[PDB]
Amino acid sequence: VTSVPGVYIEEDASPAMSVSASATAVPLFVARFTPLKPELAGVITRIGSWLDYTILFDSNVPSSVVDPTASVALRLYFQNGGGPCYLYPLEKADDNGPLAALPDLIDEVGEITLLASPDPDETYRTAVYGALAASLDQHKGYFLLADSVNGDAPSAVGGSAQVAVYYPNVEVPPLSLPPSALIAGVYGKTDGERGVWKAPANVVLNGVSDVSVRVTNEQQAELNPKGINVIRHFSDRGLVVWGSRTQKDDDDWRYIPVRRLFDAAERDIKKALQPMVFEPNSQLTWKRVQTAIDNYLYRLWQQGALAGNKAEEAYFVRVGKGITMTQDEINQGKMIIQVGMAAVRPAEFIILKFTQDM
Amino acid sequence: PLSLPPSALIAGVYGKTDGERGVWKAPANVVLNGVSDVSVRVTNEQQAELNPKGINVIRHFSDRGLVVWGSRTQK
Numbered sequence: 236v237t238s239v240p241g242v243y244i245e246e247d248a249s250p251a252m253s254v255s256a257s258a259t260a261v262p263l264f265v266a267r268f269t270p271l272k273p274e275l276a277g278v279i280t281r282i283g284s285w286l287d288y289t290i291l292f293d294s295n296v297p298s299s300v301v302d303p304t305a306s307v308a309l310r311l312y313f314q315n316g317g318g319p320c321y322l323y324p325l326e327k328a329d330d331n332g333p334l335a336a337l338p339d340l341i342d343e344v345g346e347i348t349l350l351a352s353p354d355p356d357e358t359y360r361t362a363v364y365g366a367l368a369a370s371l372d373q374h375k376g377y378f379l380l381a382d383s384v385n386g387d388a389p390s391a392v393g394g395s396a397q398v399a400v401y402y403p404n405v406e407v408p409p410l411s412l413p414p415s416a417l418i419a420g421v422y423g424k425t426d427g428e429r430g431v432w433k434a435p436a437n438v439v440l441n442g443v444s445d446v447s448v449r450v451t452n453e454q455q456a457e458l459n460p461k462g463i464n465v466i467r468h469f470s471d472r473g474l475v476v477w478g479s480r481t482q483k484d485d486d487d488w489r490y491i492p493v494r495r496l497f498d499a500a501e502r503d504i505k506k507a508l509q510p511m512v513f514e515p516n517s518q519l520t521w522k523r524v525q526t527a528i529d530n531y532l533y534r535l536w537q538q539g540a541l542a543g544n545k546a547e548e549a550y551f552v553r554v555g556k557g558i559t560m561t562q563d564e565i566n567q568g569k570m571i572i573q574v575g576m577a578a579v580r581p582a583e584f585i586i587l588k589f590t591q592d593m
Numbered sequence: 594p595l596s597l598p599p600s601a602l603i604a605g606v607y608g609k610t611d612g613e614r615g616v617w618k619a620p621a622n623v624v625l626n627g628v629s630d631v632s633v634r635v636t637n638e639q640q641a642e643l644n645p646k647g648i649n650v651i652r653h654f655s656d657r658g659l660v661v662w663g664s665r666t667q668k
Contacts, residue, residue, distance in 0.1 A: 238641040240621075240663055 252285040252310070254317035259431050259499045260423035261319050262349035262380075263341065264312075264416065265363050266305040268324035269293045275324070277333055279340055282320045285313050292322075307407060308353040308416035314442045315420025316427070321347060328359040334366040341370065341377075348498070351380035353416035355404075360413070364391040371397040376498045382413040383463055386454070388482060396483035396494050402458065403446040403466045405474070411447050414466055421476060431499045432540045434479040434492045434581040436464075439472055446474060479581060493578045496540060500576065504528055516565055521554045528552045528574060542579035550576050596632050599651055606661060619664040621649075624657055631659060 237243060263279065270276055271293055282288050288309060296303040312320065321344060325333055341347055352363045364381055368391050371377055381389050383402035392398040401418055404411040421438040450458075450465045455478075458465060464478030479491040488494050507527050514520045532550040535541055543549025553559055553573040560571050606623040635643075635650045640663075643650060649663030 238644055239637045240640075240644060241637065 252313045252317075254284040254313055255423060255427055257316075257318050257423040257427050258346075259426045259495070259502075260316075260349055260419065261321065261346050262312075262351045262419040263321045263323060263347045264305075264309065264419075265323045265325050265337075265350075265352040266308060266354045267303065267326060268305050268322055269296055269303070270324060277324075277336075279321050279323050279344055282309075282322055284317065285310065292324075302410055304355055304410055304412060305353070307410065308412055311407070311412070311442045312416045312420045315417050315438075315440060316422075316424030317420070318423045319346070325363075328356065328362045331362075334362055337363075337366050338370040342375070348376065348502075349378050349380055349419050349422065351415040351419040353413055355411060355413060357384055361389060361391060364389055368392050368395075371395050376502050378495060378498060380415040380418055382415055386458060386463065388461065388463075392482065394482050394484065396481050396485070396488035398462070398482045399464060399480075399491055400462050400482065401464050401466060401476070403448050403450060405440070405443050405466060406445055406447050407443055412443075417443070418476060430538070430540060432492050432496045432578060434490065434583075436476055436479040436491075436581075438476055440466070440474040440476065443474060479583070490580060493580065496578050497576065500531075500535065504531060504574070507531060516568060516570060518556070521570060524570065524572065525552050525554045528572070532574070532576065540578075542577045548577065550574070597628075602628070603661060621661055621664040623661055625651070625659040625661065628659060 269292060271291065275291065280291060282291070288294060288306075292306070294306045296306060309320070312318075323337065323340070325337075350367055352360055354360055354363075360382065364379070367377075367379060371379060371392065372395060377397060379392060379398045381392055381398055381400045382404075383389065383400050386402060388398075388400055399418075401414045403414065405414045405417060406412070417440050418435075421440070422435050425433055425435040425438060446466055446468060449468055455463075455465050455467075459478060459480065462478075462480040462482045464476070464480060467475055467477040469475055480489060481491055481494055483489065483494075508524060511520065511524050511527070514523075529552050532541070532552065533546065536543055536546050536549045541549035551574070554570065556562065556565070559573050564571065602625050603620075606625070607620050610618055610620040610623060631651055631653060634653055640648075640650050640652075644663060644665065647663075647665040647667045649661070649665060652660055652662040654660055
């Protein structure tokens with residue numbers, strides 16, 4: 236309604252929200268989002284900032300004892316470290332039509348890394364976690380952020396290394412939210428400031444005040460030798476995410492930062508070698524591919540990602556015809572590359588051992 | 594007090610603006626030297642029906658004086 240070329244004044248605005256930039260934590264929040272224009276009802280839309288959410292989606296949605304919590308969960312996402320933030324509005328749980336078409340729509344968009352469905356209903360998430368469980372073991376690089384109900388895994392994703400469960404529901408001034416919308420925020424904050432090789436487990440959660448269940452040490456002692464990753468309350472600090480384990484009990488893929496380092500390195504090598512597809516499958520191309528991986532793995536080692544001291548102890552790239560291939564495999568049009576890395580594990584136990592003898 | 598059409602003054606402030614800022618700068622914050630007051634003090638609400646045409650009202654601001662206020666053409 237601006238027509239006079241002067242300066243206009245409004246008086247009951249809401250404060251705007253900042254958004255960060257990250258390439259390793261791009262989530263897909265599956266919740267009960269209510270669109271304004273109904274063409275984006277069964278598709279995935281990109282929400283670059285909070286201002287993009289208020290134009291495309293209804294951000295008020297007045298309550299009726301039920302309370303809409305999907306718009307509240309995104310405000311806590313951008314307060315904890317924003318992102319490009321893909322959304323999939325899925326209204327009710329039991330419609331097995333759009334849930335069967337969900338993993339085929341995720342692959343059409345190139346850049347989803349995290350899943351993290353932020354919904355307070357329990358049977359809603361079980362229908363989502365079961366529909367996404369088959370896409371986690373297909374080497375596509377996704378990472379599910381599940382939520383425990385009473386202190387255990389939701390059993391649709393039992394022991395895969397692509398899943399990080401987070402137990403306590405987090406209360407907002409009081410509606411209780413599942414913590415996956417906030418933890419998806421603190422991944423983007425940690426990766427931008429420290430890298431994917433850093434454990435995302437000392438970040439103080441902005442926004443929220445208190446968790447729904449104050450968890451002691453003795454019940455975390457039976458939970459942390461599973462991947463449960465309790466949100467703890469410390470009096471001097473506030474609400475600190477406390478735990479960086481996955482569902483896999485293997486010695487290799489036990490920790491979140493070791494797992495997401497390999498998922499991010501495989502994703503960036505894949506984006507670098509796609510210009511080298513449909514090249515002539517010759518020894519000149521195999522050395523151009525080996526150097527493009529060796530240049531990438533060197534600049535991870537020199538910024539602290541890989542656990543080495545010589546750069547021959549951190550990584551290796553191997554390609555050849557006597558090595559890693561046979562002549563029958565070149566003739567069917569493929570090259571086979573062996574890449575290895577060595578990551579560093581976090582220190583999660585500190586023993587003090589006091590005395591007064593000297 | 595004799596009332597003049599403003600085209601002799603606006604032709605002056607084009608040469609002042611282009612010499613100091615260039616032709617790509619909008620000539621619409623120049624305080625008119627010389628003259629004291631316009632013949633009609635134009636409100637916002639009648640400029641709101643005029644500025645979605647090219648009318649380009651000479652406005653009076655108390656701290657500044659007479660400021661040319663508007664940089665639209667007839668197209």
